[PDB]
């Protein structure tokens, strides 16, 4: 089957700059009789249907604005946007129509900028949690950027990876930031056999990891 | 121009069969072909297959062998798609694709088909509060955990919509055939703990509403 790769996966852009997307195929998608390239670029909004923008990889569809243009033929396919807007926050795809079965791309998403970082969001477990027979300590990461972050759970100096439930959010529409929650659940007698719980997270904009912990007794 | 109306969300158990429709209007059904695209993992798109309604030409993907058989309706002008032997990896949103020309293809609104061996439970909520007596930040953050509900979604507001600013809603995670979520809002230190706050969760599938004061 014809497989396609996309590069890069994600990139941070500002308002008004030029965005170039690359789609590469393993085989040639050029039909020699009519010099056409059977590939089309896609665009899907969060909560809406995916729509087409560029057909035959070099021509514009009616209804698409003049900022969306495409170039390339055969193997290298390029989609160049002249000036992005605030409504251009979407995920782009490229799909070939050369041979069956049809395959899709990996997906490219654009981001915004920049410079967000958290300090402390440590919440101890409440009294209503232990009556149900379990225990749960949470760690949020609000107002942080970029989304590439690593969370680590430490219990009395020992690393524990089982029971960690992570959850990432999308980009905010007010300050262009992200939020991440990490919930470690456990049973009730394991919570009483330990005292200290350390919430560890390493960041890119800091040269030292932020350490913070709390005690049970 | 052309309308592609599909079915709504369905709650099905594992082992049954689900049928997905795609109503066509505004154009003739016996001229253009219909395709199906399965969207998994949020962003990844998978091709299911296609059907020619006039000559009964049917092709399917290698990943959908003995799973998806396509059937068209020549009298009601609509398409049908049925699945057999549903498993846990079939939790995805499915679209019907209208192959008009090689220039443009029209899409539908999508059918959310989730599958779990799962009963509708009322959500149990617990308030969260920081256990420290003092802090260095001028803001105090709070939250409440929503655990043990089915199905999606649950609308979580704060103080009956008055504290709408600075709210952060996290997506749910499936653990033991039931979803869990959380929320965090930022509160200035001039109100807490002299002024009380409340968590308002709502579940229209269970018709419950519990208020927890922090």
Residue numbers in the entry:
A (entry chain b): 1 to 217
B (entry chain a): 1 to 214
Paper text:
The S protein is a single-span transmembrane protein that protrudes from the surface of SARS-CoV-2 virions to engage the host receptor, human angiotensin-converting enzyme 2 (ACE2). The ectodomain of the S protein consists of a receptor-binding subunit termed S1 and a membrane-fusion subunit termed S2. The S protein of SARS-CoV-2 forms homotrimers on the virion surface and likely exists in two major states, namely the “closed” state with three RBD down (receptor-inaccessible) and the “open” state with one RBD up (receptor-accessible). By using a combination of biochemical, virological, and cryo-EM structural analyses, we identify three types of cross-variant neutralizing MAbs, represented by S5D2, S5G2, and S3H3, respectively, and further define their epitopes.
To investigate the molecular basis of S5D2-mediated cross-variant neutralization, we performed cryo-EM single particle analysis to determine the structures of SARS-CoV-2 B.1.351 S trimer in complex with S5D2 Fab. Three cryo-EM maps, including the SARS-CoV-2 B.1.351 S-S5D2-F1 (associated with one Fab), S-S5D2-F2 (with two Fabs), and S-S5D2-F3 (with three Fabs) states were resolved to 3.5, 3.3, and 3.5 Å resolution, respectively (Figure 4(A-F); Table S2; Supplementary Figure 8 and 9). Only the RBD-1 is in up configuration, which binds with a S5D2 Fab. The epitope of S5D2 Fab on RBD would partially overlap with the binding sites of ACE2 on RBD, leading to clash and spatial hindrance between ACE2 and the S5D2 Fab. This is in line with the high potency of S5D2 on blocking the interaction between RBD and ACE2. The surface property alternation and side chain enlargement induced by the T478 K replacement in B.1.617.2 may break the interaction network with S5D2 Fab, leading to reduced S5D2 binding and increased resistance to neutralization by S5D2.
